[PDB]
């Protein structure tokens, strides 16, 4: 049924399961072979020396086309799907790959599979916006300094666990094909063991759009070959960012993947609370503490509320909701009292739809039109008694005077 | 298509076709031949002189039984189905036959059949209830007075189209067998030509359960075993759906009830369906199908009610009204933002989040209530704007926690 609530329906974290992020989707790139129909040469070794094949690329030749569809497709380890670039390209030039998702995500695995050898210098980007701003992610190079002005294999400081290192490790060839690079962002971070309480890291994992640019690749020797770029498939793992408030993500009314935000949360990412849940501040539900949102109490007399920080602060960290436009002649933070003109119908429940009633005070026996809104005792004058001030008191006789009804007796 | 809807799908009055009613139904009766096996004599007129035969009845004798199925079966004019009663019985006795239906009907004609001679005295009953209360109709006897305290062949006054007349017609023998009795309720009624606008006649046709009593039979001779007998019964009708259901269907508790279309409810289409009471229920007329009509809630309620004064004061126009307005709704159609939210004019008129909060400036607006129509918040003294955020012409803004706008020279 619902994993968002525990055995006893207790609100517990419900999460979309781990899935590859890039599966079956479109990517905008810089260029690709076949326009104009291009060639590319491929060398193969044997025992002690080399032998080089070479081929051509027309995108209008489907089997000689090598689209990025070869990347998002299923990677058959027995019928590979090699995408191809235009050939003869290198630094200094941006070999740029773009990606706009439309939903903010976190990544765990970053995996690749090669049809080409592994280049030397490249970096990672990301965009927490929808394709407007872009920031890098990590660095990789042999010469971190001369090319990137970077240190080789730097340390991850605790004061900036958002450090981006550069290394020459595993930038090697072999592999000439099928190279396996599995970036794990989780590696090396000293406070990764408690990521559930690493919000800056919980921001480092925040990502909406992704960009990948290359310029440099290795050399050998020394158009014989048409050096190019090629890759067989792509897998990158992550889970849909619902802040721990939705077990999956579905489309919008305008074709947009959104969370069905539970735990009283709203927004495409459960980033905000659901409306009228302005009682305690927004938080993410934790495993030990259900940080769901919570609506305001109006005692069934209003549908809107707001919040102030001092309220929760002065509440000993307990609550801060307050209702607005308290109907049924009610008033208060919980619409929990009748305003001037009405009183509390004590017979009705504490949240009844007509719990506030006007004071039907004796227009003669009561002195005013206001009754005790707590008790309902109307304004009994000098000798007048009774709740609505109707009866005369002991030793007090009713008179037909429209002003002085009850009079003491000696 | 649906006969409940016109050529252009207009919800035209739909009617069950005229069909026989008592075909195949069971009836509990008082007594009949065969218990114990009884005898009975039958006379035949050979041209001029007389000859009387005589027979017996065992109910446990299938071919010598005389079951009431002989009345409900199809009558072969060449293989008649003569039911018979016990013999040695006559007035004064309620020789009564009853029937509990379970569905209200409208009837026009009444037909009979005979294997025995046509007797003299018999009566009619019915129930607008389910076999509990019982009321008569016309009478048939020689002495409408001495027996029924009634006049013979009375007139059908317009002022009482509920008159109960008595006549001697067709109590004769011959026929001694194969007697033919036909009755038309509308005969004599001056107001039968406008039955659709003759509600008393629309009540005069009301019938749910039927009872019929016999007493007398002619002693023509007059040593004999006298009885009563009949070959079949056919009664045509249409299932009472007020013109709002084209038929009647069986219920989940075995109840042949109207499939009430035209927004009508009740086993007879006599009432409106729940949430179908904008104008009260009425019966489909030849001029107007007077169908029921739902309440208007603009997608903002689950229950509704009605008051006639609304329809009264509407110049005969409308009157539905909703209950329990959820999802930021309130009103007769739950059709306004309550003392609370305001109207998001950009959003459609019936959205589940249509009403929008009065986001009044906690400083720049004075009160917490906005002109929920215009959303105009309480702009203070130099403040303008809907939520009262801007200062007005000639007003200097201050960061004061109370008074932002200051007049300018
Ligand atoms: C990209 O890579 C792909 C696959 O390798 C190549 O695909 C070719 O696409 C063309 C489309 O034009 C096709 O060529 C076909 O062969 C014909 C040979 O010429 C004879 O044509 C007929 C018999 O087919 C004879 O009657 C005639 O007298 C010629 O002797 C072409 O002429 C045809 O192309 C014609 O079709 C297009 C519409 O499709 C018309 O607009 C033109 O008039 C054009 O002449 C015929 O369709 C075939 O599908 C592929 N040919 C191959 C693989 O050899 C692309 O050629 C390649 N891109 C480039 C730029 O070469
Ligand atoms: C009402 O109308 C019906 C229909 O016409 C008549 O139905 C009778 O039904 C009985 C039912 O039993 C029939 O009786 C039959 O005749 C036998 C005569 O007795 C001899 O039985 C055998 C030969 O059959 C001999 O060996 C024996 O020595 C007797 O000489 C009855 O004995 C039979 O009935 C027996 O069978 C039932 C089970 O079926 C047993 O439980 C009993 O022991 C019972 O005795 C045999 O069935 C008879 O034929 C029918 N009569 C007809 C068709 O005319 C009723 O008779 C009638 N009512 C009256 C009051 O007459
Ligand atoms: C290569 O570098 C970056 C992207 O990797 C691009 O940056 C450009 O910088 C100039 C500097 O004034 C701007 O005018 C351009 O608008 C930027 N390009 C954008 C924003 O797309 C640069 O254009 C790239 N060169 C290419 C792709 O040929
Ligand atoms: C004949 O007439 C009616 C039914 O046609 C019966 O009326 C009964 O009246 C007595 C009066 O005290 C009541 O106690 C009975 O309950 C009535 N019976 C009904 C209503 O069924 C009358 O009994 C009939 N006579 C019979 C059947 O022998
Ligand atoms: C791989 O699949 C493609 C898709 O049709 C097919 O054309 C090709 O022949 C397959 N590979 C081999 C070796 O057959
Ligand atoms: C109303 O009645 C209560 C009951 O004791 C009393 O304490 C109070 O003073 C009265 N007046 C109010 C609440 O204004
Ligand atoms: C009438 O039908 C019944 C059916 O059982 C049959 O027994 C009887 O002999 C028939 N009689 C005539 C006259 O057709
Ligand atoms: C609400 O706005 C209308 C629109 O001009 C205005 O006429 C009215 O005075 C405002 N206040 C109300 C209706 O209380």
UniProtKB/Swiss-Prot annotation, chain A:
Glycans are attached at residues 58, 79, 94, 372. The keyword Membrane does not apply. Residues 10-239 form the Laminin N-terminal domain. It is found in: Secreted; Cytoplasm. GO terms for cellular component: actin cytoskeleton; basement membrane; cell periphery; cytosol; extracellular region; glutamatergic synapse; nucleoplasm. Netrins control guidance of CNS commissural axons and peripheral motor axons. Promotes neurite outgrowth from commissural axons but acts as a chemorepellent for trochlear motor axons. These effects are mediated by distinct receptors. This is Netrin-1. It comes from Gallus gallus (Chicken). The lineage of its organism: Eukaryota, Metazoa, Chordata, Craniata, Vertebrata.
């Amino acid at each position: 049924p619902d994993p968002c609530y525990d055995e006893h329906g207790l609100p517990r974290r419900c999460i979309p399961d781990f899935v590859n992020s890039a599966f079956g989707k479109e990517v905008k790139v810089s260029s690709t072979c076949g326009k104009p129909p291009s060639r590319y040469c491929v060398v193969t070794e044997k025992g002690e020396e080399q032998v080089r094949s070479c081929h051509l690329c027309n995108a209008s030749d489907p089997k000689r086309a090598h689209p990025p569809s070869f990347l998002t497709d299923l990677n058959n380890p027995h019928n590979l799907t090699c995408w191809q670039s235009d050939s003869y390209v290198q630094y200094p030039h941006n070999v740029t790959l773009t990606l706009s998702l439309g939903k903010k995500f976190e990544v765990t695995y970053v995996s690749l599979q090669f049809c080409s050898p592994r280049p030397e210098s490249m970096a990672i980007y990301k965009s927490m916006d929808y394709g407007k701003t872009w920031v890098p992610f990590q660095f990789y190079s042999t010469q971190c300094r001369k090319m990137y002005n970077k240190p080789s294999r730097a340390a991850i400081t605790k004061q900036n666990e958002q450090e981006a290192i550069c290394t020459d490790s595993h930038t090697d060839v072999r592999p000439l094909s099928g190279g396996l690079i599995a970036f794990s962002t989780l590696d090396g971070r000293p406070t990764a063991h408690d990521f559930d309480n690493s919000p800056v890291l919980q921001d480092w994992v925040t990502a909406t759009d992704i960009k990948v640019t290359f310029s440099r690749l290795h050399t050998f020797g020394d158009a014989r070959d048409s050096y190019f770029y090629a890759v067989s498939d792509l897998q990158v793992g992550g889970r849909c960012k619902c802040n721990g408030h939705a077990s999956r993500c579905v489309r919008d009314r305008d074709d947009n993947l959104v969370c069905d935000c539970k735990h009283n949360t709203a927004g495409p990412e459960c980033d905000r609370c659901k409306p009228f849940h302005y009682d305690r501040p927004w938080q993410r539900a934790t495993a030990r503490e259900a940080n769901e949102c919570v609506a305001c109490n109006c005692n069934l007399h209003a549908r809107r509320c707001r919040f102030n920080m001092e309220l929760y602060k002065l509440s000993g960290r307990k609550s801060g909701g307050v209702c607005l436009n308290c109907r049924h002649n009610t008033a208060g933070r919980h619409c929990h009292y009748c305003k001037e003109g009405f009183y509390r119908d004590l017979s009705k429940p504490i949240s009844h739809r007509k719990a506030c009633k006007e004071c039907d005070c004796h227009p003669v026996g009561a002195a005013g039109q206001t009754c005790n809104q707590t008790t309902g005792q109307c304004p009994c004058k000098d000798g007048v008694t009774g709740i609505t001030c109707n009866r005369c008191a002991k030793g007090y006789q009713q008179s037909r005077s429209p002003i002085a009804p009850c009079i003491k007796i000696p």
